[PDB]
Design a protein around this nucleic acid. Structure first.
Lengths: 185, 35, 47, 134, 144
RNA sequence: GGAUAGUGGCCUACCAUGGUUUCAACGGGUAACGGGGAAUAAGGGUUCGAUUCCGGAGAGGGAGCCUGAGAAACGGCUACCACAUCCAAGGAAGGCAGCAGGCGCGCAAAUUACCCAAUCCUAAUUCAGGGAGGUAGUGACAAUAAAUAACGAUACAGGGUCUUGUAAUUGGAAUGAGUACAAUGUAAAUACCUUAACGAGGAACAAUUGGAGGGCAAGUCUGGUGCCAGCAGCCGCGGUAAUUCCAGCUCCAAUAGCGUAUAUUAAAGUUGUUGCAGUUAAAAAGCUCGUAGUUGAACUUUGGGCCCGGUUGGCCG
């Protein structure tokens, strides 16, 4: 009789799964960001639809209604601080015209690629999951991290993770062991 | 008579004006041997 | 055919799987399209 | 690591039990882990503690390593630290001794063995010895 | 107009006109009377398990054959006897007599890929193993 | 009047003849515990709710009662009924719709495990107890996050002096699935978090489930078997109510998931209040009267004047 821990789905499959226009649209997104499966596009198009639906029901409400003013400015603050909107489009009429690629641009593996450090978009993903890139001071290995605007300048290599110094990996260690017993003497 | 049916409706969509793939020797075969 | 009793403790090299498989489709589908006939065919036989 | 550092946050003087709560945070940049008994040592001369009177019980290493956070409480005057502390921590610290008792099933089966006997049974043992032999 | 009452105190007619016309449905009437519990071979069940009695030669035609023939099976709970459907040939050597198969509905049909009239119960498992895995040489069926 | 803790046809004595109903009484069915709520989304709705919370009832079926503030109690008693246990044949003992467990049923559901450390409860009470509860085992019910590789060099094919693909060409880096000192964790353990050491060159540490006349995404593919009173006759071609008979290649979708079956919802405006239809496609009573029901013409302080203090935009700052 403990309280049931609430859960909910974070993705929704499309009603029309087979259309050549959309199948090529989502595959274009998958290649240029390096997405493992189509759930990643499904997940973004789910929460994007939730943001648009919430903001759409605010727009039916009249001006200066404090429910619209409080919830609306909350929704503008959350999207700008993440970075989806710019600072010049802080209105409810612009969040309806958001695009899926705006959210994917704010990911971690997309942002670590835009900051050098990757040399390809697929190398950006596989670097992160090997526990190399640390946001601020804490090591992350989640490619859907959704880097905030303030944590943009703190993305570097961890004090661990041999690309940032500190005792290179086991493959080089066995290599250093082999040339120590062969070429060292 | 599955091969007779599949050809019969296929030139009907020539006259209706829609795309349809041109054929070969798999037209009236079980594409999948079942379970 | 039978599973080994202690197993749980032509050939073509395998396709990549997961994220790297989508990299193969994106290269194959449209970056540097291989066969072009004006309508972008996808599976020919003997040409 | 050159030296591990311990930091105490949210200190609460609690004269109700004559102790102090604090959220102990330790930074171990390289080594492996906390080594709790060294934190029991370092939290002794952090002010004045006479190390049997200090206690730490919850700890969790942060993801990726480096930082570990937990709860630790220090008494004064170890004599009532003997009293207010639970038994399982004193056994964990070795300050008390683990008593040995039977399992749950054998304790309860022993209990219902007595529940069928009225009195001490000292008459019954004399009765059944005469009953069996004669 | 429109042939129905529309004024503001006419909710009794609009409520009970719908109740009677709902009886001319098919899913609604089949649900309320509970004919799944009175007439269907499956007692409202999704699957049913039954004892095979004999195998029939319900064949496509005489010798030049598209072999799709199946068995006569009695369900174990209500005791009703139904006609089954087995997949392609090579699974008839699996299904002997009295094997206690687990069978499910067949349902969807096109104008190809199985057009046999009078059968709606494909056989999913025989002797408690499978028919997909038993056909694709994953496991073996014990003999009774 | 009696009875109850107490009102009251609750029961009793007498006296009245009432009480409900087409605004559906009464009877019948429910594979009906009620509700908070669940799924489904353009709206309204349709379907579901045995099940973590609240309320009701039952402890194999009925009934009766002791004790107590509280029980018509069943881990209390008594009787009857239905099952069923032991034996020395006289007698005695029962009630898992509590927790594990087993038989039977079925499409369909787990360990005869550890502990009161937490949450709370009971007692004469900080201390004892609790299959209440928690921990762990089984567990692809359902939900969250995302491994199965990334980079460079050489030679060709390109776009064309800078940019991509190809190769049984080549090079070193990085990492966790695993094993495991130790430490954290825990009532004690397992597991997660951290980590000394080992741990990748492909038949390694190898991803499946479905699908290709349209839906619809994906073939001017291959081989073999059987038949043709069909052409030709070194070969072959075509048909084949073989509804392709058996295999393979290629391609597409989803992906540690995927398919099937039943039920239900959307699509659906095939339940239509929003929002169907009735000449000829399902459907206007043969015709009129007429109670309930539903619906019912217009009409009665309209207009003008006075000042007052407000919330919005501005010429203004």
């Amino acid at each position: 009789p403990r309280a049931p821990r609430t859960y909910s789905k974070t993705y929704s499959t499309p009603k029309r799964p087979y259309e050549s226009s959309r199948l090529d649209a989502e595959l274009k997104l998958a290649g240029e960001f390096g997405l493992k499966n189509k759930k990643e596009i499904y997940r973004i198009s789910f929460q994007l639809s939730k943001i648009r639906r919430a903001a759409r029901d605010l727009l039916t409400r009249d001006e200066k209604d404090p429910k619209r003013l409080f919830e609306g400015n909350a929704l503008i603050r959350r999207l700008v601080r993440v970075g989806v909107l710019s600072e010049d489009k802080k209105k409810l009429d612009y969040v309806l015209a958001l695009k899926v690629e705006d959210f994917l641009e704010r990911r971690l593996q997309t942002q670590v690629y835009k900051l050098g450090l990757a040399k390809s978009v697929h190398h950006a993903r596989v670097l992160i999951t090997q526990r190399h890139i640390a946001v601020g001071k804490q090591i992350v290995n989640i490619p859907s991290f959704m880097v905030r605007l303030d944590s943009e300048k703190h993305i570097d290599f961890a004090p661990t993770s041999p690309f940032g110094g500190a005792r290179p990996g086991r493959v080089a260690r066995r290599n250093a062991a082999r040339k120590a017993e062969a070429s060292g003497e | 008579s599955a091969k007779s049916f599949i050809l019969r409706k296929k030139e009907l969509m020539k006259r209706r004006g829609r795309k349809v793939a041109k054929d070969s020797k798999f037209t009236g075969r079980k594409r999948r041997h079942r379970f | 055919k039978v599973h080994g009793s202690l197993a749980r403790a032509t050939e073509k090299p395998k396709k990549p799987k997961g994220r790297a498989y989508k990299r193969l489709l994106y290269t194959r589908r449209f970056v540097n399209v291989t066969l072009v006939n004006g309508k972008r065919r996808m599976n020919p036989g003997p040409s | 690591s050159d030296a591990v550092t311990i930091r105490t946050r949210k200190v609460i003087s609690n004269p109700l039990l004559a102790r102090k709560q604090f959220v102990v945070d330790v930074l171990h940049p390289n080594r492996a882990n906390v080594s709790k008994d060294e934190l029991r040592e370092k939290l002794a001369e952090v002010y004045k503690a006479e190390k049997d009177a200090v206690s730490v019980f919850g700890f969790r290493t942060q993801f990726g390593g480096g930082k570990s956070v937990g709860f630790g409480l220090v008494y004064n005057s170890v004599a009532e630290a003997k009293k207010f502390e639970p038994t399982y921590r004193l056994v964990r610290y070795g300050l008390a001794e683990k008593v040995e008792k039977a399992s749950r099933q054998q304790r309860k089966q022993k209990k219902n063995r007595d529940k069928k006997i009225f009195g001490t049974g000292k008459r019954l043992a004399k009765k059944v010895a005469r009953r069996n032999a004669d | 107009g429109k042939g129905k009452p529309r004024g503001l105190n006419s909710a009794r007619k609009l409520r009970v006109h719908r109740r009677n016309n709902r009886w001319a449905e098919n899913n609604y009437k089949k649900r309320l009377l509970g004919t799944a519990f009175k007439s269907s071979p499956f007692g409202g069940s999704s699957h049913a398990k039954g004892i095979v009695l004999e195998k029939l030669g319900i064949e496509s035609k005489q010798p030049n054959s598209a072999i799709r023939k199946c068995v006569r099976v009695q369900l174990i709970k209500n005791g009703k006897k139904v006609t089954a459907f087995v997949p392609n040939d090579g699974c008839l050597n699996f299904v002997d007599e009295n094997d206690e198969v687990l069978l499910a509905g067949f349902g969807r049909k096109g104008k190809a890929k199985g057009d046999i009239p009078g059968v709606r119960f494909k056989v999913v498992k025989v002797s408690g193993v499978s028919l997909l895995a038993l056909w694709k040489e994953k496991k073996e069926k014990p003999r009774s």
